[PDB]
Symmetry: C3
Subunit: 231 residues, 3 copies
């Protein structure tokens, strides 16, 4: 385990997702409101899944070697298994907040699936130049998601409760900034151009992941917006 | 096929899931009620999926060799492919019975996914001691599911029709007893401590599977609880 | 890339799915109706997914070699990854058109999953004779889907708006004819009996895919049936 310099960030990531999971689980114990239960369910599942996949990376299961550039390159494939489930869940949190129509939810989740799936293919592609073709397609899918979060959702929120509008706005901004960093880290890290070494890359992803999941969740679950308006 | 002593239980399992599938399909032919159609759909799909995966194990496709303990260990991975889809379907049957809120359904299905996914990782893990780490996490996810089935669902059922309350109670009890045996069999069988040989392990899983799927389905689909109250 | 004679059909397929995707995306820009948004979302996702998987086949990622018949046989596994997601989406388009009950939708999607999953197992099976066992099970699942599209849906459509009835009828007929060709092509092509060479097989699948996705989508998205009745 300790033979990989990035182990420390995997261990920290595992611990923080674990602690985040336990905290949200305990916090959601005293919740009977059906709307709030949905948000607690979605939001607690996110670090729970991330916990399992961080642990899989820490123990070495979620790592494979991919030959490109005439080298055996360590690729943590478990990230994509995580993101495949957790990024649509995060989008669902946002979509449910603003009472998105079903068509838009399907568009988001579908685009997200394409984003992660093509990122995975890019990560495992042995022809070096083609890795960036997949990166570009995945990034286009991300750009679509970001467009919808801004020019389909933000104007929907203004027509809703002020607490849901303000909470959505914060979470939207957090999401757009944090999510946009991922293709950059991939591009310059071990999966892409290889300018940033894997240990630093792992640190960067860990900071992004904890912020995008536990940070996000802390903001969401402390908000009154997740409760139905009741007396 | 006959070169594996466990083939007989795989063959029997295949036949019983097949027959179970055909029986539920025929039985559901004369059903127009929209609620009953949901239960027939869910409940017929369960042995249909199990049929395909038993057949895959029988024909040898759903088997791989995993090196641990300095041995090549036969691991039937197809079980997890089965359970990944059939256990949430079984939980959906229960959840729909008691008209569970969406948040609770998501919690159940999500926990179930974690249960099966981590069981799969445990099954394929090459570091012997780590297999039991995954077993423990999976078992914790199972315990969460069982907690919800008792302390989130049972009190919901009492507020519903007597036929749905009584049927849920029976199916809940069947589910908790049968499902709890699976981590025990895994732990002592070829995936875990290796005390019980694979042929007996396969027998045990076959008895559990047929009971948890066809047995469960027979109880559910004979009940009046799957029909909306109509005149 | 050009080393495989079928590359031309993969390239054409990629281009046509890409163009189809862009066309539906642009066309759906000026849509606010919640019902129409659902259909645009579903129908645009279908060629988008197919685009990615055609590209994966073109670049060689979505190809593996399967030993059977004492030969190394090129099997494009990416087709199943495509179909796993796009065929239920296509069925959802049809089901939503006729306002299918949830039980029937689950039956369709479930049968479809079995159809594609067993086709995949058949495609990767190393025992030649067993490949056709999987083909038969998959074809039985297809026959179930076709039965439901005719003897569960058609009589539902007649009870609905004339525009939805007529559009459903056309799309149903297109779907039944086109989908039925797939098991035939598989059976006689490289996955099955090997009578038709892979380059021609790839052409046939490309024509079917573009017709079943872009052709289908063009018919659906030009129809008034995807809009709620409004003044
Ligand atoms: C009802 O709706 C609210 C429940 O959602 C909240 C329910 C949660 C989504 C349930 C999912 C968590 C499962 C209990 C997972 C079990 C293992 C966890 C990964 C625990 C790991 C953290 C610990 C080991 C440090
Ligand atoms: C609505 C939305 C959800 C839509 C989703 C968008 C989605 C279509 C985007 C593309 C997803 C697709 C790329 C997933 C591919 C998974 C693949 C990387 C798994 C690894 O297999 C790749 C090679 C080794 O590199 O296997 C060696 C060859 C082996 C023989 C491989 C054979 C097994 C195949 C992998 C079977 C395909 C199953 C499905 C791809 C499962 C989906 C997995 C998940 C990652 C989407
Ligand atoms: C409408 O809602 C009720 C239909 O659900 C019931 C519909 C069923 C869920 C449909 C799923 C069954 C498919 C027909 C699968 C086809 C192959 C089966 C595995 C048949 C195998 C048994 C036989 C070969 C012994
Ligand atoms: C809401 C709920 C549904 C949440 C679900 C909870 C879920 C997160 C729990 C964990 C699921 C995750 C462990 C699934 C892992 C699948 C993996 C075992 C497949 C086999 O690949 C493992 C190694 C060989 O041992 O592959 C050799 C290396 C290869 C290069 C592997 C690369 C391909 C990757 C497998 C791509 C990942 C795709 C997804 C994991 C598909 C999910 C499969 C299913 C089993 C969940
Ligand atoms: C809101 O509901 C309507 C939007 O659905 C329509 C939304 C679409 C379903 C969104 C899915 C498309 C994504 C934008 C995918 C991005 C990459 C595409 C594959 C583009 C490829 C075509 C081009 C490169 C030739
Ligand atoms: C409600 C509906 C959706 C129901 C769906 C119906 C469905 C049950 C029908 C059967 C699906 C099932 C056959 C999928 C099998 C995927 C499998 C082909 C992936 C490739 O792995 C096969 C072998 C190499 O040939 O791997 C070499 C051995 C490796 C060690 C394999 C270990 C990893 C396993 C693949 C883990 C299983 C994960 C799930 C099968 C993911 C589903 C993938 C998708 C194709 C259904
Ligand atoms: C909790 C984890 C999160 C929120 C991860 C989000 C990941 C992304 C937004 C990844 C995007 C990528 C691209 C846009 C292209 C390059 C490859 C990816 C997958 C890193
Ligand atoms: C129809 C099949 C059923 C109902 C199978 C259920 C399986 C489980 C409840 C399995 C649980 C496991 C654990 C709790 C940890 C050990 C590994 C598993 C996957 C066997
Ligand atoms: C857009 C792609 C479409 C509509 C593909 C549809 C594919 C099928 C209907 C495939 C059916 C098969 C069988 C019925 C058995 C043989 C194997 C398959 C998977 C080709
Ligand atoms: C979106 C964040 C991308 C910026 C990443 C900056 C990382 C700087 C770390 C120094 C690079 C290490 C190179 C020498 C080993
Ligand atoms: C490929 C995995 C996609 C599924 C991710 C799980 C989250 C799905 C959320 C469903 C949103 C509801 C749409 C109507
Ligand atoms: C990883 C596979 C999970 C999907 C299993 C299929 C059953 C899902 C049931 C969905 C329940 C509805 C939730 C609102
Ligand atoms: C194995 C992949 C199955 C999921 C395919 C995605 C489409 C699912 C459509 C869901 C229909 C809604 C059912 C209530
Ligand atoms: C085009 C949609 C406008 C809002 C999205 C902001 C785009 C941020 C660019 C991210 C950079 C990724 C490499
Ligand atoms: C803690 C929830 C109470 C109901 C669940 C019963 C737990 C049964 C233990 C199963 C043993 C698994 C090894
Ligand atoms: C049995 C359902 C009647 C409508 C389905 C038509 C069946 C077409 C046969 C397709 C041939 C596949 C090999
Ligand atoms: C070896 C790198 C070759 C450059 C490939 C860049 C492709 C990026 C695609 C963006 C449209
Ligand atoms: C393929 C990238 C798409 C980003 C621009 C958005 C196009 C308009 C979409 C309107 C729903
Ligand atoms: C070789 C066996 C070593 C014991 C591992 C047991 C781990 C179980 C984890 C329960 C918390
Ligand atoms: C991680 C195992 C959880 C089992 C105990 C239940 C904790 C309380 C959950 C309340 C929804
Ligand atoms: C080598 C071919 C052997 C014939 C197998 C055909 C099986 C088809 C199953 C249809 C019930
Ligand atoms: C297993 C093939 C099934 C095709 C015939 C349909 C049987 C009746 C189903 C009624 C819903
Ligand atoms: C509750 C604390 C969870 C921490 C477990 C994972 C940390 C890795 C330690 C090596
Ligand atoms: C309808 C009977 C189904 C039995 C087929 C599978 C049994 C295995 C026989 C070797
Ligand atoms: C918009 C045009 C998309 C075409 C890209 C794929 C075609 C393959 C060219 C070799
Ligand atoms: C992106 C950083 C999130 C900060 C989380 C703090 C939560 C305090 C309520
Ligand atoms: C767990 C055993 C189930 C027994 C099924 C019998 C069904 C008869 C109605
Ligand atoms: C199966 C062929 C479909 C033809 C599509 C033409 C669409 C024109 C409206
Ligand atoms: C990590 C355990 C949380 C302790 C309770 C915090 C207040 C809800
Ligand atoms: C007005 C909301 C600002 C949130 C920005 C957070 C950036 C990490
Ligand atoms: C809208 C601001 C996005 C900032 C992107 C930063 C990526 C590191
Ligand atoms: C396995 C075939 C079932 C025969 C009909 C049973 C009575 C519905
Ligand atoms: C009161 C219901 C009892 C059911 C127990 C079944 C145990 C297998
Ligand atoms: C509530 C009783 C559970 C019994 C567990 C038996 C496991 C073999
Ligand atoms: C492929 C681009 C489509 C151009 C607009 C067509 C009319 C909606
Ligand atoms: C009456 C609808 C006829 C459609 C047939 C299309 C065959 C490809
Ligand atoms: C209902 C007519 C089906 C035609 C099947 C054609 C397959 C090539
Ligand atoms: C909570 C489980 C953590 C396992 C870490 C083992 C190194």
């Amino acid at each position: 385990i300790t033979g990989r310099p990035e182990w420390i960030w995997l261990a920290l990531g595992t611990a923080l997702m674990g602690l985040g999971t336990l905290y949200f689980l305990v916090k959601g114990m005293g919740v009977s409101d059906p709307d709030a239960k949905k948000f607690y369910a979605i939001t607690t599942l996110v670090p729970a899944i991330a916990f399992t996949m961080y642990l899989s990376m820490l123990l070495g299961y979620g790592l494979t070697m991919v030959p490109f550039g005439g080298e055996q390159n360590p690729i943590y494939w478990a990230r994509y298994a995580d993101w495949l489930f957790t990024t649509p869940l995060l989008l669902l949190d946002l979509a449910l907040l603003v009472d998105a129509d079903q068509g838009t939810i399907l568009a988001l989740v579908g685009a997200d699936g394409i984003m992660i799936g093509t990122g995975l293919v890019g990560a495992l592609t042995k022809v070096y130049s083609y890795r960036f073709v997949w990166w570009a397609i995945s990034t286009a899918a991300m750009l679509y998601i970001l467009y919808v979060l801004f020019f389909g959702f933000t104007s929907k929120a203004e027509s809703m409760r002020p607490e849901v509008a303000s909470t959505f706005k914060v979470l939207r901004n957090v999401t757009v900034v944090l999510w946009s960093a991922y293709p950059v880290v991939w591009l310059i890290g071990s999966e892409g151009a290889g300018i940033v070494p894997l240990n630093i890359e792992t640190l960067l992803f860990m900071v992004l992941d904890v912020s995008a999941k536990v940070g996000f969740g802390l903001i969401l679950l402390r908000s009154r917006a997740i409760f139905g308006e009741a007396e």
